[PDB]
Ligand binder design. Structure first.
Ligand code: Q8G
Length: 301
């Protein structure tokens, strides 16, 4: 009926705003990115600081893991993405081509491709092995806020401040659907690929049916009018939607009923990012400059 997330650890180390937190697919690590130009790696279970990964020339908006947990990609205001070997901390490739800040990034499940979105209004698809751009999609008419591959890698969903979410065939780059306009600040496919979760800067999350192009559920009660705040499908226990919020709380909703089931109190600034652990009922959350911490929470269900 309700989870009971409780605070387990508070982590500190970044020196400017955190932008993203992500658990590795193998469950071992949490990665964080920051405006301080750094990626930090932390133990997923006890929060133990592991390493700092450095090389970008300006702040980082997003980081994402390869499926085997060995690689990270980061998206930076320096107009590049970087592919990193996590074990060595070394930059393997610098992905050059965007003409403005890179805001979002993700590997496909196969992890042979990366997708990126930029302030330059394009979505790019990159070959991981060569580090070269394969396609540039003229995807949007305003900054691209999120990019995500579906469960088998065959489709990409993008979102933009232009108010649109677009679905693309990965192999051909063709736009198969546009969901119709408040700025869309985040989007991702549901685990089964049939639905799309989208955040808009009007304090609203929406669950869309891809095949019907129609909104099925809305989730409200939180505050989101300014920042790029991701939303997650929590699937290890009860089926929830999880999101940060501009009122310093983590919100958790019942996916089916849309009711709020928990609000996590503890942060002292906007909760800018949350992530859900792949096997345990564990949430990571990060707050802005008045707070400066990442918090790890645990629920029994
Ligand atoms: O695993 C998934 O991707 C997934 C996606 C939507 C799911 C689900 C699982 N279980 C129930 N739903 C509802 C949510 C509200 C309407 C759509 C059906």
């Amino acid at each position: 009926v309700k989870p009971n997330y409780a605070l387990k650890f508070t982590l500190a180390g970044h020196t400017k705003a955190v932008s993203s937190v992500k658990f590795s697919p193998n469950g071992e690590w949490l990665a964080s990115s920051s405006a301080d130009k750094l990626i930090k790696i932390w133990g997923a279970y006890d929060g133990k600081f592991e390493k700092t990964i450095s090389g970008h020339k300006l702040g980082i908006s997003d980081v994402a893991w390869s499926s085997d947990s060995n690689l990270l990609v980061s998206a930076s205001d320096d107009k590049t993405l970087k592919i990193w070997d996590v074990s060595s901390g070394k930059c393997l490739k610098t992905l050059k081509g965007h003409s403005n800040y890179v805001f979002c990034c993700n590997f496909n499940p196969q992890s042979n491709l990366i997708v990126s979105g930029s302030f330059d209004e394009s979505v790019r698809i990159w070959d991981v092995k060569t580090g070269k751009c394969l396609k540039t999609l003229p995807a949007h008419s305003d900054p691209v806020s999120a990019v995500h591959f579906n469960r088998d890698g065959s489709l990409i969903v993008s979102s933009s401040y232009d108010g649109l979410c677009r679905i693309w065939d990965t192999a051909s780059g063709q736009c198969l659907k546009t969901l119709i306009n408040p700025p869309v600040s985040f989007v991702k496919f549901s685990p089964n690929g049939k639905y799309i979760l989208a955040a808009t800067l009007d304090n609203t999350l929406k669950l869309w049916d891809y095949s019907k192009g129609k909104c099925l559920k809305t989730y409200t009660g939180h505050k989101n009018e300014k920042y790029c705040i991701f939303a997650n499908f929590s699937v290890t226990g009860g089926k929830w939607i999880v999101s940060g919020s501009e009122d310093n709380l983590v919100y958790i909703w019942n996916l089916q009923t849309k009711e709020i089931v928990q609000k996590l109190q503890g942060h002292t600034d906007v909760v800018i990012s949350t992530a859900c652990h792949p096997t345990e009922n564990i949430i990571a959350s990060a707050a802005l400059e008045n707070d400066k911490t990442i918090k790890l929470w645990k629920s029994d269900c």
